[PDB]
Structure formats: structure tokens, C-alpha cells
Design a protein around this nucleic acid. Structure first.
Length: 94
DNA sequence: CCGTTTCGCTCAAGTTAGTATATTAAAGCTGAACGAGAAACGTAAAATGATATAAATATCAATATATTAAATTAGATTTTGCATAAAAAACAGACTACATAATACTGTAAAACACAACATATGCAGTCACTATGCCGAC
């Protein structure tokens, strides 16, 4: 399921909703979630999950191909935490 | 085995047996020319799969405790569907006033052609030549 296939299956089910409307809606939601995480704000969707931002202290990296040294500026990285409903439904085991 | 004559067949000219329609009225069929929106294609560009390794970071059970997004109300209020009715403006229903065509009637020049005596070129009336083989006569 890609970004396009996602809009396709959502437009097929929603007949009373223009296909073009669903196409833009999906693109605006993803862009809104990507912009929020950029501003430094978290995301919390009850049932789905919750996006966060974890800090990464600056450390002297090392080229994994050769083994040299490379500086690494301190930055933040997105982190998703599956919700309760998401885990239980995605968990096929016990 | 082969030939000859009768018989099954079809062409050609008489002798009988059978059935009977035209216009309205309104379609119905089908070859051929006419006029846009959406998605499968494709080359090109952007994001991602490829790839590995010691060090860095996330994986998560089991429970106490402060924190918080947010559906669940619950009461407050702009928003929304629907006329009611009068102030205000549009516009037939009247009417005289005003400028304008169809018509009423007088005033005057001149178009359009018969009628009549002449004048005369031109077509018609009457006769011979132009132009070249017939007919008749010989070969």
C-alpha cells in the first residue's frame, strides 16, 4: 500500500466524495503531519499511534565502508509509537 | 459383344384452370462523415533500495504515579430557513397638447400621340453577268 494506492482504496469506498477531493485530502494531511513534526510539535492519534522527536547528541561518526572519521551535527529524529488498538490488530500471535 | 428398334425426355404449339389492388401515412434499416475527456505509455528526474560493522540507540516486561489530549456532554448563541407587510418605484389607465402623415382641393406646366402634307432613301421589282461543273458527245 503506497501513497497512491491509499488514496485509491479510500476513493473507491467513498462514492459521495470526489476522487479529486480525496487525492488532495490525503496529500494535505500528510503534509500537515510532516510540517508539525518540523516545527517541533508532537502528534497523538488515539488508536493509531503517536509521533515524537528524539534528540541525537553530536558524535564523531565513522564511514561504514572505509572506517574514517566524520563529524555529526546534533539533530532530532522522528519516532512513531504504535497505539493500543494498532498493536492488538497487527499482532497475529498471542 | 455390337447393331437395331422401341421408349423415356424435352422442345414447340394449342386448350384450360385460378385468383383479384392502389394509395396514402409513418416508419425502420444502415453505409458514411462528424466531435471531446480520461488513462495507459514513456523518457527523465527524485526518492529509495543496495551494503556492511563496531558503536549508539531502541527493544520491552511489571507496576507506581503525575500528566493530558479530547470525546462526552450541557448549556449558550450565531446561524439558517421562511415569510409578513409597508415604503417606494414601476406602469397601465386617461387626456390634452404638439408635431406629423394621409387626405381634401385649387393652381399650372407639359408629357404623349393622332393627324396631315411632303421629302426620299431603301427595299423590292425586273434583267444580265459572275463562277464552274453538269448533260450530252466522244473515248
Amino acid at each position: 500500500m503506497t501513497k497512491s494506492e491509499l488514496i485509491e482504496r479510500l476513493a473507491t469506498q467513498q462514492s459521495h466524495i470526489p476522487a479529486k477531493t480525496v487525492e488532495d485530502a490525503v496529500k494535505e494531511m500528510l503534509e500537515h503531519m510532516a510540517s508539525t513534526l518540523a516545527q517541533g510539535e508532537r502528534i497523538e492519534i488515539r488508536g493509531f499511534g503517536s509521533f515524537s522527536l528524539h534528540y541525537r547528541a553530536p558524535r564523531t561518526g565513522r564511514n561504514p565502508k572505509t572506517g574514517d572519521k566524520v563529524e555529526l551535527e546534533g539533530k532530532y529524529v522522528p519516532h512513531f509509537k504504535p497505539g493500543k488498538e494498532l498493536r492488538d490488530r497487527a499482532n497475529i500471535y498471542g
